[PDB]
Scaffold this active site. Structure first.
Site, PDB file in Angstrom:
ATOM      1  N   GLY H  29       0.783  -1.379   0.028  1.00 53.75           N
ATOM      2  CA  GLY H  29       0.144   0.081   0.011  1.00 53.75           C
ATOM      3  C   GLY H  29       1.043   1.229  -0.136  1.00 53.75           C
ATOM      4  O   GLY H  29       2.187   1.233   0.117  1.00 53.75           O
ATOM      5  N   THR H  30       0.009   2.534  -0.287  1.00 53.04           N
ATOM      6  CA  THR H  30       0.794   3.823   0.153  1.00 53.04           C
ATOM      7  C   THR H  30       1.270   3.931   1.112  1.00 53.04           C
ATOM      8  O   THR H  30       0.727   3.527   2.166  1.00 53.04           O
ATOM      9  CB  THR H  30       0.159   4.916  -0.576  1.00 53.04           C
ATOM     10  OG1 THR H  30      -1.122   5.111   0.198  1.00 53.04           O
ATOM     11  CG2 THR H  30      -0.718   4.579  -1.878  1.00 53.04           C
ATOM     12  N   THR H  31       2.337   5.052   1.510  1.00 52.66           N
ATOM     13  CA  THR H  31       2.792   5.395   2.802  1.00 52.66           C
ATOM     14  C   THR H  31       1.773   6.206   3.350  1.00 52.66           C
ATOM     15  O   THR H  31       1.335   7.208   2.899  1.00 52.66           O
ATOM     16  CB  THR H  31       4.093   6.146   2.357  1.00 52.66           C
ATOM     17  OG1 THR H  31       4.952   5.446   1.744  1.00 52.66           O
ATOM     18  CG2 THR H  31       4.832   6.167   3.836  1.00 52.66           C
ATOM     19  N   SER H  74      -2.755   2.014   5.638  1.00 56.09           N
ATOM     20  CA  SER H  74      -2.055   1.692   4.368  1.00 56.09           C
ATOM     21  C   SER H  74      -2.395   0.114   4.023  1.00 56.09           C
ATOM     22  O   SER H  74      -2.543  -0.440   5.240  1.00 56.09           O
ATOM     23  CB  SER H  74      -0.511   1.713   4.389  1.00 56.09           C
ATOM     24  OG  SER H  74      -0.107   2.982   4.527  1.00 56.09           O
TER      25      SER H  74
END
Ligand SMILES: [Cl-]
Ligand SMILES: [Mg+2]
Lengths: 240, 241, 231, 235, 195, 116, 250, 243, 244, 5, 5
Positions: H29-31, H74
């Site tokens: 996932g994204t930060t 995330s």
């Protein structure tokens, strides 16, 4: 509650549990149904592997559903009792609400409906049973003979057989049963039914059961001696 | 080989999921110790904060179940907190129904019975934790009762749990073989904590700062945990003799 | 491989294969385009026939006077999800005398899809939806994936060869967003967008399906000789 | 084993795709829609000559304005017919009118995907639902166990379907009379059937605005078979 | 109010039941048969609240007929009476009790004996030489106490029943529009036309 | 009494009066006085000696002397006249039986013998 | 969630074996030795207190349990399984008998109820059999003294004397030679101690042995006087000292 | 083997492999980050701009619970929404009975127990999110991070997703260089920088910055989104620091 | 999920047999032999206890022969625990029938109900069948003396003489040879013991390895007595018939 | 009812 | 009642 789908489709579009239920029927003792002009006869095989049997109390192969309708079967005996009980309850339920006994077609449609339900209900296996349902509709003199099978399909038959070596006795009936002129009397109809079983049975002793159903709730089961007289006459005519 | 996935018997008459639950017990790599005084029960546990980003005040494996009962857990924190919440609920319910504070050994038995069910019922997994319950019971006095994933429980004069339990166990065994008594013959709980920390240092062969330990104390009518500064005072006393 | 038997099983790389297989059903589905200005929001759907004797499967479903979607994938799943939206739109009206916000409609679809990805026995939804609507914050276009992921966009396309239409809209973004108080020109841009996803077949009178909602325009579907104007 | 509601890597439900194989093994059923009415025809396919063919019921009345033909595991259809009849009557009770053919079809198709671990498996039978209503006139629908339904000017289902459908592709126009449609169903049935077509192993039916849904007498169908034979011998 | 009488003679049971169905001040019918054939040798007469009477009798009839088919055997009157009593005994403590009073006349083929059972809506059961329900019961009891004998013939039984009905017509204030009489013996159940 | 026995076996402890008291009052309260049980609950346990009364509606109270029933007023008259703090065993039996006698003689609902 | 294991985890194998019951019996075999001997005037049940750690207080772990005032139980196999069975056994003695008949159940009927609980864990959905064999000793007015064994299957048998667990085969041979129908209770205790010494490796004293009797009524253990018909419990657990006294005359 | 096919099965190690596989979804996932400041907490997240067609500032990721708790996650976004929905129910029931808004540690355990419950049965899948949440209660500021296993601790700073290692390094510097503590307005600026620095692990596609905060002084202990001038000031600061 | 671990106890084989029923019958074939013989004037139930010990209390022991009411008894072959579940169900049905109709339950009606319960466990519920075969010995005033058997399938049949458990093939051949219709109880006692004596896997047949019961109209006048033989009574009938 | 001090 | 300030 146990929900598991036991009857499912296979890649070739078959339901194996329903097809394996038919194999249970194939194993079952032979049952035959023949309708005459003014009667229907239900013949049934009793395998003679079991002697020292008490024939008074042993469950008979032909069961009355009402006073005017009978059911015989091939397959698992234990499974047949559950269909017979449900059918007997529905017969009284119909009399209570419609103020009229079931037609043979209605009782068949009900039993066939139960068999179908057990092919797409979770946690249950199909009935290992095919039935022959025979009788006369209230105030009707037209003979009725229906067949059901584990899948839940049903249909009307001039004459039909189910169970082990049914292929052989169906072969016999297909060449020996004329539609334009069916067995005129009770004698002729019983004779053709006994003849059809003698193709498969072995000994004509306590191995053949015959039940005659006539119009207006007239049902009687023939005795050993009565059937033995038919067996004697058939083979004496054959010696020629 | 599905007899290794759920809690059914293997041909040897074993429950592998129970055995593997015992192995999860040491996943944290933390060692706990429990001893009894005259008037008190003391429980000490290693505290490890590997990440600098962690708030060290929230990193704990000691739980105040009731006012009287404390519980230290050896195993992952999710299962530890599952067991903690349940014990808190069970202790409260007991007091409401029966009109007196749930004894330490009775809570231990109850949590052990719950554990037993997970070993017999398939749909529930065992908790990967060993629960050490401590109190000063009003009938039995200073009490240590320990539960495991098998649903086994027993009382203890003293006990130890974690990767290096055997080293701590033998150290305590040797002390009680000398004194020939079932407790630490000491008036104040402060000195019983000093004994607990001292015998852990000797057993593990490691020194401790104030932030390396976590201490729980049970007296008559309350269980409480020590602050970093309360432990520092304890460590100073040990060094000065 | 070993981890695609059911929706309750993660793969060793943290993938949900049953959800990814459900996502595949959408790509097999016929193309549908969605785009909006500040005043109006348009759905354009290429309907698919079984053969020449058959009808063209309807793609666009009305959810309220101010909201509706287009579908790509399992039509029965679109019926279940659109019925749920109809009820949620309806509950909002009856209880709060309030037209349901398009953003909140997205949030509700997401949460309904999610429950089917975390529980044993169930299966993911096998359909993707483009929800258009006009609410108190103006025109809106949403893209629903049965993973549960819902996204608010100026324009998009889902189904087979959808990438062609999506690239066109990505170029035309600055043009079609400015088409305010001109419904016909916004539909033209939608028809020109879906045209980039056609191969062999072209847009016929019983092939094309258009829907529009805007400032003083209830959600209305155009089929048959009503779209002959735009061919 | 594996889930009953499982998707294949191609994004199809295994059990639905397998049920479609069961329907291919079924006896042929044909429907043709005209401006004068909709005709429904079936192959009876008796397993033995001792089986009384008239007891084979593969064409069924749902209401006065809606008929139904079936192909596949025909036992599975009984509960679908029961639901359809209940839906048609229930709607007449609630709204004092005839239910639209599309609405009735939609109601039947809502049962289709109600299976999981509700019923244990999909239906192993396809339905041709023919009817008339005031809004959209004479209509023919194909109801699958997928829950999808298509409207058709003409449609064939069962063992001889792809052969029959290719024939219907050439023969159907918008100006077909009811008499022309009857002969056309009989012609295509006779082409794809194993045994020779007669009034006992095949059955016709139609739905007109005036007379509603009628299953044809064996005597009536026999005459149309004789009319077919003569017009084919005429060139 | 409704008259149902029972008399058990030497070799049969006779049931007399009023033919009038009345609701308040309205006579709904003058040819009503307040009887059901439970089995070929068992007959049940019933009086009580409208609807409950027929619904109860037909429900009992269905259950006894089901037993007969399943076992290919006829339940004894003692057994049928016990079943009926137990169904009524269930109903008193139910949400809406059946307000039905029944007479069960049967011929036991095993013992070759006629049996009469009187059961009230509470499930109170007794075997009697003669029985009745309602206002009529008290007059008929006193008269039958005098005249009844155990060794009476069917014909003697009918004459005594004839006297009971005659005296009831004179003495009773309501018009019950005559009675239907049915005899239960070894040969089965038959209706006496002349009365 | 049954549930107290099972509790005693489960906990490996002699039962407490407060347990019997708590279990009785929660049961009686559940049935909103429809279970017409008016009880005086006494006993010795590891906690000490206890005396409680519990009314049918699930109300409990604590005392050194209690009386319940139709003869409670006759009995309470004697208890209020002769009770003191620090009674001996012999004195407490005498006071208890005298309070019952007061009920026996002066109440038509009470009579016959005195059980202690 | 929901318990979706509604199906049996104990099924018949092609050979007609119930695997999980056999495997349960294997668990019992690994278990510490316990035995029971029936005398003319009492019954004795005995087992070894196999202490898991010397720090553990073995007195707190009760292997020999009172079920009713006149019925005791000991086991071989999985201890936790035994503990929950004792809880269920004590409760069912009340719910299914004492709350109906106002007296404690006779030995054979309480055994029958325990047997039923263990049979159900052998057929019911989503559960494994209990990994214990019980020995249940009891007295009742009409049957007198009796000793029963209960197995994971739910099967139970009455015994004059028997042994279960680790060294049962050897123990049962030893009991066959010593047992007669003229044994007094003290004679049965003496034989019980002799038999149990053979299966024990380490320390053999009152602190490492758990022994209880079903014998004469103990009015001193009743807790109240005044009711002549209540004469007190027939179940008595022998003290550490009482065992050591009989090990000197061994 | 086969120990990793079913959830709630212990491996011979004593590990739940299905939970460890859920962690892989989170790592993908994204930060997302959280910073605990003097009198509150700051939350920031990386939103990947897949296409120009994405409407800027519309696809909001950070979610409020009650009025005082911020939640960012995330991994599988839907799994995060499901967990926040439960959190809102738990917070509602707590306030209904006890009147006071749910304390942060109390709220942390409510999520903790719920996530842990999804590791007890094979009939459910573990959560495919790590959740960074916190806010202001009566006892002050609290920042928590919650893993698929149900494990959670208090944090001075927290990070999860593809750029967590980069973020964690930047958070560790702030903790060392500010022992006395960080102000709410400083934490917003720093949050922006750390997301921009952590974007190097997602450098292919350009991104959109989203920040929220609960501060006793700056927001009156309520959760608010950073908007307009204050957001642009944080972007400008972040852009200046990478150059 | 849980599907992975389901044995599916209620499915057909490709040959149309019920796996679990067949395997349950295999189990019962290893159980101690039970014999029922029906005579004109009563019924005999003989059964062999499985390899006993000298330290088993026999006089208070029951594993084979159980009383269902005063008129009906059963001989058990299979899991004793499974049998006791079914026996208690049968005892309750018998008392339900008596309460309802104020008449003792006819033998077949009781047999059919127990058989219908067994059938259910083969068609639904996903549980293992009962590993039990019964011989029912009963009297009613419709059919008089009756012998039935039921097996895990739920199928039941009537018999003049029958065996269940071990060596039924051998036992049934010996019974079929020596049985006659006009036979009396005293003769049927002798046949039952002689049959067990020849089929037994044990070295010799002794009193301590047998359970024996008779249902006789040998009760003063018009009534029926059940006699469960005591150890000393089994020893006496073994000497009388000349086997020891 | 009843018996009732 | 009923006890009841
Ligand atoms: Cl418990
Ligand atoms: Mg488990």
């Amino acid at each position: 509650g146990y929900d598991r789908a036991l009857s499912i489709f296979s890649p070739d579009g078959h339901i194996f549990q329903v097809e394996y239920a038919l194999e249970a029927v194939k194993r079952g003792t032979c049952a035959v149904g023949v309708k005459g002009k003014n009667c229907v006869v239900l013949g049934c095989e009793r395998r003679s592997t079991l002697k020292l049997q008490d024939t008074r109390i042993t469950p008979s192969k032909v069961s009355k559903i009402d006073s005017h309708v009978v059911l015989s079967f091939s397959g698992l005996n234990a499974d047949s009792r559950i269909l017979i009980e449900k059918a007997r309850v529905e017969a009284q339920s119909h009399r209570l609400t419609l103020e009229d006994p079931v037609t043979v077609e209605y009782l068949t449609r009900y039993v066939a409906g139960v068999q179908q339900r057990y092919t797409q209900s979770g946690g249950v296996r199909p009935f290992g049973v095919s039935t022959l349902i025979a009788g006369f509709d209230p105030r009707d003199d037209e003979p009725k003979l229906y067949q059901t099978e584990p899948s839940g399909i049903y249909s009307s038959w001039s004459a039909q057989t189910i169970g082990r070596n049914s292929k052989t006795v169906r072969e016999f009936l297909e060449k020996n049963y004329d539609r334009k002129e069916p067995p005129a009397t009770v004698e002729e109809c019983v004779k053709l039914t006994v003849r059809s079983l003698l193709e498969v049975v072995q000994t004509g002793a306590k191995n053949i059961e015959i039940t005659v159903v006539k119009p207006d709730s007239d049902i009687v089961a023939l005795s050993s001696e009565e059937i033995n007289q038919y067996v004697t006459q058939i083979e004496q005519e054959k010696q020629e | 080989g599905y007899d290794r996935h759920i809690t059914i018997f293997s041909p040897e008459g074993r429950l592998y999921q129970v055995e593997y639950a015992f192995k999860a017990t040491n996943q944290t790599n933390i060692n706990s110790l429990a001893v009894r005084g005259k008037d008190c029960t003391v429980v000490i546990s290693q505290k490890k904060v590997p990440d600098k980003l962690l708030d060290p005040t929230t990193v704990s494996y000691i739980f105040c179940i009731s006012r009287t009962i404390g519980m230290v857990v050896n195993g992952p924190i999710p299962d530890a907190r599952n067991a903690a919440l349940r014990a808190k609920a069970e202790a409260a319910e007991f007091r409401y129904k029966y009109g007196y504070d749930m004894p330490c050994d009775v809570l231990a038995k109850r949590m052990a019975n719950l554990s037993q069910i997970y070993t017999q019922r398939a749909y529930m997994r065992p908790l990967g934790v060993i629960l050490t319950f401590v109190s000063v019971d009003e009938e039995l006095g200073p009490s240590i009762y320990k539960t495991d994933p098998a649903g086994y429980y027993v009382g203890y004069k003293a006990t130890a749990t974690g990767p290096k339990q055997q080293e701590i166990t033998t150290n305590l065994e040797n002390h009680f073989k000398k004194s020939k008594i079932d407790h630490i013959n000491e008036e104040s709980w402060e000195k019983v904590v000093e004994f607990a920390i001292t015998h852990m240092i000797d057993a593990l062969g490691t020194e401790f700062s104030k932030n390396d330990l976590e201490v729980g104390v049970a007296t008559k009518d309350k269980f409480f945990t020590l602050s970093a500064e309360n432990i520092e005072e304890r460590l100073v006393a040990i060094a000065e003799q | 491989n070993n981890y695609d038997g059911d929706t309750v099983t993660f793969s060793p790389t943290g993938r949900l294969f049953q959800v990814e297989y459900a996502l595949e059903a959408i790509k097999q589905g016929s193309v549908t385009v969605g785009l909006r200005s500040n005043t109006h929001a348009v759905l354009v759907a290429l309907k698919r026939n079984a053969d020449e004797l058959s009808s063209y499967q309807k793609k666009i479903i009305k959810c309220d006077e101010h909201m509706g979607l287009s579908l790509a994938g399992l039509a029965p799943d679109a019926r279940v999800l659109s019925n749920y939206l109809r009820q949620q739109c309806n509950y909002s009206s009856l209880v709060f005398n309030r037209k349901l916000a398009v953003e909140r409609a997205g949030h509700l679809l997401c949460d309904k899809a999610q429950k089917n990805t975390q529980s044993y026995g169930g299966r993911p939804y096998g359909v993707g939806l483009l929800i258009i609507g006009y609410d108190k914050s103006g025109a809106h276009l949403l893209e629903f994936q049965p993973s549960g992921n819902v996204t608010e966009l100026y324009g998009t396309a889902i189904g087979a060869r959808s990438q062609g239409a999506k690239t066109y809209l990505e170029r035309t973004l600055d043009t079609f967003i400015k088409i305010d108080g001109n419904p016909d020109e916004l539909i033209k841009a939608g028809v020109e967008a879906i045209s980039q996803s056609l191969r062999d077949e072209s847009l016929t009178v019983d092939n094309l399906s258009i829907a529009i909602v805007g400032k003083d325009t209830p959600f209305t579907i155009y089929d048959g000789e009503a779209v002959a104007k735009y061919i | 084993d594996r889930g009953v509601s499982t998707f294949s890597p191609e994004g199809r439900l295994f059990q639905v795709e397998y049920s479609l194989e069961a329907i291919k093994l079924g006896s042929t059923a044909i429907g043709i829609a005209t401006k004068e009415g909709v005709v429904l025809g079936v192959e009876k396919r008796a397993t033995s000559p001792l089986l009384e063919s008239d007891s084979i019921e593969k064409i069924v009345e749902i209401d006065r304005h809606i008929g139904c033909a079936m192909s596949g595991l025909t036992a599975d259809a009984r509960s679908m017919i029961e639901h359809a009849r209940t839906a048609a009557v229930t709607h007449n009770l609630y709204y004092d009118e005839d239910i639209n053919v599309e609405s009735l079809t939609q109601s039947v198709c809502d049962l289709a995907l109600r299976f999981g671990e509700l019923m244990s498996r999909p239906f192993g039978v396809a339905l041709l639902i023919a009817g008339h209503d005031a809004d959209d006139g004479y209509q023919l629908f194909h109801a699958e166990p997928s829950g999808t339904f298509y409207r058709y000017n003409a449609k064939a289902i069962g063992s001889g379907s792809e052969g029959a459908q290719a024939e219907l592709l050439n023969e159907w126009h918008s100006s077909l009379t009811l008499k022309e449609a009857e002969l056309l169903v009989l012609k295509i049935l006779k082409q794809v059937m194993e045994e020779k077509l007669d009034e006992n192993n095949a059955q016709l039916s139609c739905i007109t605005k005036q007379d509603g849904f009628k299953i044809y007498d064996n005597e009536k169908t026999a005459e149309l078979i004789k009319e077919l034979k003569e017009k084919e011998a005429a060139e | 109010m409704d008259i149902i009488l029972g008399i058990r003679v030497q070799d049969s049971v006779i049931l007399a039941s009023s033919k009038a169905v009345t609701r308040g001040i309205s006579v709904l019918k003058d040819s009503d048969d307040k009887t059901r054939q439970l089995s070929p040798h068992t007959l049940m007469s019933f009086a009580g609240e409208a609807g409950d009477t027929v619904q109860f009798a037909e429900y009992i009839q269905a259950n006894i007929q089901l037993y007969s088919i399943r076992e290919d055997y006829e339940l004894s009157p003692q057994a049928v009476s016990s079943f009926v009593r137990q169904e009524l005994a269930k109903s008193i403590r139910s949400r809406r009790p059946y307000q039905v009073n029944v007479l069960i006349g049967g011929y036991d083929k095993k013992k070759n004996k006629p049996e009469l059972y009187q059961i009230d809506y509470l499930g109170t059961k007794v075997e009697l030489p003669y029985g009745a329900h309602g206002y009529s019961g008290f007059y008929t009891f006193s008269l039958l106490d005098h005249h009844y004998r155990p060794d009476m013939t069917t014909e003697e039984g009918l004459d005594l029943l004839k006297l009971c009905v005659q005296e009831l017509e004179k003495r009773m204030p309501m018009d019950f529009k005559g009675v239907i009489v049915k005899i239960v013996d070894k040969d089965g159940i038959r209706q006496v036309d002349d009365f | 009494g049954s549930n107290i026995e099972l509790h005693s076996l489960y906990t490996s402890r002699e039962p407490r009066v407060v347990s019997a008291l708590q279990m009785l009052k929660q049961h009686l309260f559940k049935y909103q006085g429809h279970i017409g049980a008016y009880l005086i609950v006494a006993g010795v346990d590891p906690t000490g000696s206890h005396l409680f009364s519990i009314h049918a509606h699930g109300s409990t109270d604590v005392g050194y002397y209690l009386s319940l029933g139709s003869g409670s007023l006759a009995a309470m008259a004697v208890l209020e006249s002769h009770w003191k703090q620090d009674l001996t065993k012999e004195e407490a039996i005498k006071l208890a039986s005298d309070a019952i006698q007061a009920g026996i003689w002066n109440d038509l609902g009470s009579g016959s013998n005195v059980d202690v | 969630m929901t318990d979706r294991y509604s199906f049996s985890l104990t099924t018949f194998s092609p050979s007609g074996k119930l695997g999980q019951i056999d495997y349960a019996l294997t668990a019992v075999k690994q278990g510490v030795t316990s035995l029971g001997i029936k005398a003319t005037n009492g019954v004795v049940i005995a087992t070894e207190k196999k202490s898991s750690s010397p720090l553990a207080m073995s007195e707190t772990l009760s292997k020999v349990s009172l079920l009713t005032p006149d019925i005791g139980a000991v086991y071989s196999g999985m201890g936790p399984d035994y503990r929950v069975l004792v809880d269920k056994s004590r409760k069912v003695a009340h719910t299914s008998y004492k709350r109906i008949y106002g007296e404690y159940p006779p030995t054979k009927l309480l055994v029958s109820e325990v047997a039923k609980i263990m049979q159900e864990a052998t057929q019911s959905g989503g559960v494994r059999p209990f990994g214990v064999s019980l020995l249940i000793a009891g007295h009742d007015e009409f049957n007198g003294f009796s000793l029963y064994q209960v197995d994971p299957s739910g099967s139970y048998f009455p015994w004059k004397a028997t042994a279960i667990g680790k060294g049962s085969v050897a123990a049962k041979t030893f009991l066959e030679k010593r047992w007669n129908d003229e044994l007094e209770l003290e004679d049965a205790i003496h034989i019980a101690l002799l038999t149990l010494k053979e299966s024990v490796e380490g320390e053999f004293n009152g602190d490492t042995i758990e022994l209880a009797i079903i014998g004469d009524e103990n009015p001193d253990l009743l807790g109240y006087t005044g009711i002549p018909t209540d004469k007190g419990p027939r179940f008595r657990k022998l003290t550490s000292q009482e065992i050591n006294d009989r090990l000197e005359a061994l | 083997t086969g120990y990793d096919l079913s959830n709630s099965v212990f491996s011979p190690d004593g590990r739940n492999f299905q939970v460890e596989y859920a962690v892989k979804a989170v790592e993908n996932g994204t930060t997302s980050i959280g910073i605990k400041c003097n009198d509150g907490v700051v939350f920031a997240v990386e939103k990947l701009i897949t296409s120009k067609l994405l409407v800027p500032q519309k696809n909001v990721k950070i979610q409020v619970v009650d009025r005082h708790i911020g939640c960012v996650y995330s991994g599988l976004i839907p799994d995060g929404r499901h967990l926040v929905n439960r959190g809102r129910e738990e917070a509602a029931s707590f306030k209904k009975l006890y009147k006071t808004p749910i304390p942060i540690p109390a709220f942390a355990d409510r999520l903790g127990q719920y996530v842990q419950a999804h590791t007890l049965y094979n009939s459910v899948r573990p959560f495919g999110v790590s959740t960074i949440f916190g806010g202001v209660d009566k006892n002050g500021a609290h920042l928590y991070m919650l893993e698929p296993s149900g494990s959670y601790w208090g944090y001075k700073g927290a990070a999860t997703g593809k750029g967590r290692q980069s973020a964690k390094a930047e958070l560790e510097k702030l903790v060392d260089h500010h022992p006395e503590g960080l102000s709410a307005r400083e934490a917003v600026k720093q949050a922006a920088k750390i997301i921009y620095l952590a974007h190097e692990d997602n450098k292919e596609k350009d991104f959109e910055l989203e920040i929220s905060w609960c501060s006793l002084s700056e927001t009156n202990g309520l959760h608010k989104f950073v908007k307009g001038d204050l957001l642009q000031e944080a972007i400008d600061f972040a852009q200046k620091e990478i150059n | 999920g849980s599907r992975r671990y389901d044995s599916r106890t209620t499915i057909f084989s490709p040959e149309g047999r019920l796996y679990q029923v067949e395997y349950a019958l295999e189990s019962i074939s290893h159980a101690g032999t039970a014999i029922g013989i029906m005579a004109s004037d009563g019924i005999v139930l003989a059964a062999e206890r499985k390899v006993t010990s000298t330290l088993l209390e026999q006089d208070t022991s029951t594993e084979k022969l159980y009383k269902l009411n005063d008129k009906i008894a059963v001989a058990v072959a299979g899991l004793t625990a499974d049998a006791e579940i079914l026996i208690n169900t049968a005892r309750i049905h018998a008392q339900n029938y008596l309460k309802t109709y104020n008449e003792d339950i006819p033998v077949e009606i009781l047999v059919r109900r127990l058989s219908d319960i067994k059938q259910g466990y083969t068609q639904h519920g996903g549980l293992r069948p009962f590993g039990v075969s019964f011989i029912y010995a009963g009297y009613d005033d419709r059919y008089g003396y009756q012998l039935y058997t039921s097996n895990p399938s739920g199928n039941y049949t009537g018999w003049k003489a029958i065996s269940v458990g071990a060596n039924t093939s051998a036992a049934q051949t010996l019974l079929q040879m020596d049985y006659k219709d006009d036979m009396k109880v005293d003769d049927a006692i002798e046949l039952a013991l002689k049959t067990l004596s020849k089929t037994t896997d044990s070295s010799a047949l002794t009193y301590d390895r047998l359970e024996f019961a008779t249902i006789r109209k040998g009760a003063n006048d018009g009534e029926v007595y059940q006699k469960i033989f005591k150890p000393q009574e089994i020893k006496d009938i073994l000497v009388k018939t000349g086997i020891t | 009812x009843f018996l009732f001090x």
